[PDB]
Amino acid sequence: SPLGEEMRDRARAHVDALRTHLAPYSDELRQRLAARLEALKENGGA
């Protein structure tokens, strides 16, 4: 029993606003958490 665009459009309504809210807030924050997490907890190691 296929759909159209009303059950799931609610998901395609708050996601488009999501993008604007944190478009540029992605690279900045990551750079702080990019170098810390390769020493402390040690994803890999011996």
UniProtKB/Swiss-Prot annotation:
Belongs to the apolipoprotein A1/A4/E family. Glycosylated. It is linked to Hypoalphalipoproteinemia, primary, 2: An autosomal recessive disorder of lipoprotein metabolism, biochemically characterized by severe apoA-I deficiency and severely reduced serum high-density lipoprotein cholesterol (HDL-C). Affected individuals have undetectable serum levels of apoA-I, and develop xanthomas and corneal opacities. The disease is generally associated with atherosclerosis and markedly increased cardiovascular risk. It comes from Homo sapiens (Human). Homodimer. Interacts with NAXE and CLU. Component of a sperm activating protein complex (SPAP), consisting of APOA1, an immunoglobulin heavy chain, an immunoglobulin light chain and albumin. Interacts with NDRG1. Interacts with SCGB3A2. Interacts with NAXE and YJEFN3. Major protein of plasma HDL, also found in chylomicrons. Synthesized in the liver and small intestine. It is also present in increased levels in aortic lesions relative to native ApoA-I and increased levels are seen with increasing severity of disease. Changing residue 34 to P: In AMYLD3; uncertain significance. Sequence repeats lie at residues 2-23, 24-45. It is found in: Secreted. The chain holds residues 166 to 211 of 267 of the full protein. Participates in the reverse transport of cholesterol from tissues to the liver for excretion by promoting cholesterol efflux from tissues and by acting as a cofactor for the lecithin cholesterol acyltransferase (LCAT). As part of the SPAP complex, activates spermatozoa motility. Changing residue 33 to S: In AMYLD3; plasma level of HDL and apoA-I protein were significantly lower in the patient. It comes from the Eukaryota. Changing residue 8 to P: In AMYLD3; uncertain significance. This is Apolipoprotein A-I. Changing residue 8 to S: In Boston; correlated with decreased levels of HDL cholesterol; correlated with decreased serum cellular cholesterol efflux; correlated with decreased lecithin-cholesterol acyltransferase (LCAT) activity.
